Amino acid sequence: LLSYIPAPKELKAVLDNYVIGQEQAKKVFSVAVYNHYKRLSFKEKLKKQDNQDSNVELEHLEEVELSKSNILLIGPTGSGKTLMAQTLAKHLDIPIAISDATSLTVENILTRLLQASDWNVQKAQKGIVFIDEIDKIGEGVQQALLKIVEGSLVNQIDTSDILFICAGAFDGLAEIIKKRTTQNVLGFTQEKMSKKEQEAILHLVQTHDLVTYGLIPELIGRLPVLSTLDSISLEAMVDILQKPKNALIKQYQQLFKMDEVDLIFEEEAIKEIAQLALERKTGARGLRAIIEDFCLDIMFDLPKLKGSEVRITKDCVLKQAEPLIIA
Numbered sequence: 001l002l003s004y005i006p007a008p009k010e011l012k013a014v015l016d017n018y019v020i021g022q023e024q025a026k027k028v029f030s031v032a033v034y035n036h037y038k039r040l041s042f043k044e045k046l047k048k049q050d051n052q053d054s055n056v057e058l059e060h061l062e063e064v065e066l067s068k069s070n071i072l073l074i075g076p077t078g079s080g081k082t083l084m085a086q087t088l089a090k091h092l093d094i095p096i097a098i099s100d101a102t103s104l105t106v107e108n109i110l111t112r113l114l115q116a117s118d119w120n121v122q123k124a125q126k127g128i129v130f131i132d133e134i135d136k137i138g139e140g141v142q143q144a145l146l147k148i149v150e151g152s153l154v155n156q157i158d159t160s161d162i163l164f165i166c167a168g169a170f171d172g173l174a175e176i177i178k179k180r181t182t183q184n185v186l187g188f189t190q191e192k193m194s195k196k197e198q199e200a201i202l203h204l205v206q207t208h209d210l211v212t213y214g215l216i217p218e219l220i221g222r223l224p225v226l227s228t229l230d231s232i233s234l235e236a237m238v239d240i241l242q243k244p245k246n247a248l249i250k251q252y253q254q255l256f257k258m259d260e261v262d263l264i265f266e267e268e269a270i271k272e273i274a275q276l277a278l279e280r281k282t283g284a285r286g287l288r289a290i291i292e293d294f295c296l297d298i299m300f301d302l303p304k305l306k307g308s309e310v311r312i313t314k315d316c317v318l319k320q321a322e323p324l325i326i327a
């Protein structure tokens with residue numbers, strides 16, 4: 001569907017229904033995914049149009065050389081990086097293949113994409129290639145990847161119009177943007193940056209930073225768009241449990257409702273579940289596992305609760321108590 005690329009605000013709206021926080025990154029991703037697809041669409045419009053007017057534009061669009069906006073997502077693990085990508089790829093119904101930088105301590109990647117788009121060369125060439133942990137790399141993998149990102153022919157697939165998205169935590173980058181970098185400091189500094197600032201300084205990263213980190217200028221140039229995500233705070237985590245369209249709590253309420261039980265998570269209960277996910281550093285990924293751990297018993301004997309109201313509390317969450325069944 002290169003027929004209609006929803007506006008950046010529309011895309012961002014979809015994003016908002018699944019990703020909490022990361023407002024800037026959401027904005028940057030939306031505009032970036034839009035510009036990428038507006039171009040492929042616009043470009044396709046002319047060709048079909050097949051005439052002299054639309055043919056001059058095609059030449060100018062080529063002459064001007066509109067660099068492909070491959071994206072580079074930088075943010076702590078579990079912040080919504082591949083989620084943002086997955087969310088939109090599912091909305092625009094675009095085939096997307098996720099991979100791992102470590103896999104290359106190859107063409108194999110484009111293979112999954114084909115599998116993800118029914119071997120239809122066309123849809124695959126309009127798809128997304130997600131490279132996670134681009135930060136884990138060695139100096140060879142990059143170049144081996146660069147050929148494909150830059151755009152080449154592989155056997156057959158043409159990777160020229162494939163949107164590349166690289167992601168990583170770049171654990172080191174934090175300090176690098178706090179050594180030989182602008183907005184320096186003349187005063188007496190008390191100690192190493194707190195991960196709060198060590199994650200807030202990233203939002204001030206420039207291309208020369210990714211280099212120092214160990215990224216070949218050849219690849220960084222291929223990632224015009226840099227987007228940084230924060231770490232999930234307690235408040236956002238609290239929102240993730242209840243706000244999104246597919247929020248865990250609504251899943252559990254949907255499931256309990258089928259057996260005519262009204263399931264309620266008391267505020268401090270949600271706060272406790274969220275605070276747990278952080279400690280255990282199991283992140284947002286670990287929310288379902290924490291809920292299952294104190295809900296299993298409840299779901300096991302749910303019938304003797306039919307028609308009533310089950311109220312989840314902090315104690316219950318901490319498994320220091322039973323849930324509040326209310327007639």
Ligand SMILES: Nc1ncnc2c1ncn2[C@@H]1O[C@H](COP(=O)(O)OP(=O)(O)O)[C@@H](O)[C@H]1O
Pocket residue numbers: 018019020021022075076077078079080081082083084167240244283284285
């Ligand atoms: N910002 C977020 N908003 C809502 N859910 C999130 C967010 N970040 C992470 N999650 C949850 O945790 C999982 C980790 O997702 P992901 O973004 O792909 O990780 P990473 O940022 O390391 O690439 C998601 O699939 C989702 O269920």
